[PDB]
mmCIF file of N, CA and C in Angstrom:
data_model
loop_
_atom_site.group_PDB
_atom_site.id
_atom_site.type_symbol
_atom_site.label_atom_id
_atom_site.label_comp_id
_atom_site.label_asym_id
_atom_site.label_seq_id
_atom_site.Cartn_x
_atom_site.Cartn_y
_atom_site.Cartn_z
ATOM 1 N N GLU B 1 -12.220 1.313 7.190
ATOM 2 C CA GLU B 1 -12.382 0.690 5.837
ATOM 3 C C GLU B 1 -11.300 1.188 4.900
ATOM 4 N N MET B 2 -10.579 0.226 4.242
ATOM 5 C CA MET B 2 -9.508 0.556 3.306
ATOM 6 C C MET B 2 -9.408 -0.489 2.303
ATOM 7 N N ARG B 3 -8.682 -0.110 1.192
ATOM 8 C CA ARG B 3 -8.567 -0.946 0.071
ATOM 9 C C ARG B 3 -7.297 -0.719 -0.552
ATOM 10 N N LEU B 4 -7.038 0.571 -0.607
ATOM 11 C CA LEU B 4 -5.953 1.089 -1.234
ATOM 12 C C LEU B 4 -4.946 1.284 -0.191
ATOM 13 N N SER B 5 -5.484 1.433 0.942
ATOM 14 C CA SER B 5 -4.827 1.774 2.116
ATOM 15 C C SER B 5 -4.487 0.511 2.824
ATOM 16 N N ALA B 6 -5.034 -0.512 2.184
ATOM 17 C CA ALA B 6 -4.790 -1.862 2.496
ATOM 18 C C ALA B 6 -3.678 -2.262 1.575
ATOM 19 N N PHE B 7 -3.679 -1.514 0.406
ATOM 20 C CA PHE B 7 -2.714 -1.724 -0.589
ATOM 21 C C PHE B 7 -1.662 -0.955 -0.023
ATOM 22 N N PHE B 8 -1.957 -0.017 0.819
ATOM 23 C CA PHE B 8 -0.957 0.810 1.333
ATOM 24 C C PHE B 8 0.276 0.182 1.880
ATOM 25 N N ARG B 9 0.275 -1.096 2.106
ATOM 26 C CA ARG B 9 1.452 -1.778 2.478
ATOM 27 C C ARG B 9 1.887 -2.626 1.439
ATOM 28 N N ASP B 10 1.184 -2.657 0.417
ATOM 29 C CA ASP B 10 1.531 -3.540 -0.644
ATOM 30 C C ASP B 10 2.383 -2.921 -1.614
ATOM 31 N N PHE B 11 2.015 -1.726 -2.008
ATOM 32 C CA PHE B 11 2.728 -1.031 -2.972
ATOM 33 C C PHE B 11 3.583 -0.148 -2.325
ATOM 34 N N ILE B 12 3.262 0.169 -1.058
ATOM 35 C CA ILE B 12 4.097 1.057 -0.325
ATOM 36 C C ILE B 12 5.364 0.470 -0.153
ATOM 37 N N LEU B 13 5.214 -0.813 -0.059
ATOM 38 C CA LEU B 13 6.199 -1.706 0.091
ATOM 39 C C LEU B 13 7.014 -1.872 -1.085
ATOM 40 N N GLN B 14 6.308 -1.702 -2.178
ATOM 41 C CA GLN B 14 6.948 -1.856 -3.468
ATOM 42 C C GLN B 14 7.419 -0.517 -4.010
ATOM 43 N N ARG B 15 7.242 0.600 -3.221
ATOM 44 C CA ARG B 15 7.722 1.895 -3.621
ATOM 45 C C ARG B 15 9.036 1.897 -3.032
ATOM 46 N N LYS B 16 9.068 1.263 -1.821
ATOM 47 C CA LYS B 16 10.323 1.092 -1.186
ATOM 48 C C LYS B 16 10.703 -0.341 -1.410
ATOM 49 N N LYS B 17 11.439 -0.522 -2.475
ATOM 50 C CA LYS B 17 11.915 -1.843 -2.865
ATOM 51 C C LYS B 17 13.261 -2.147 -2.142
#
């Protein structure tokens, strides 16, 4: 179960622009 960790590719992605 994840949410943020689902976000984990979302923003992670956006941390690494």
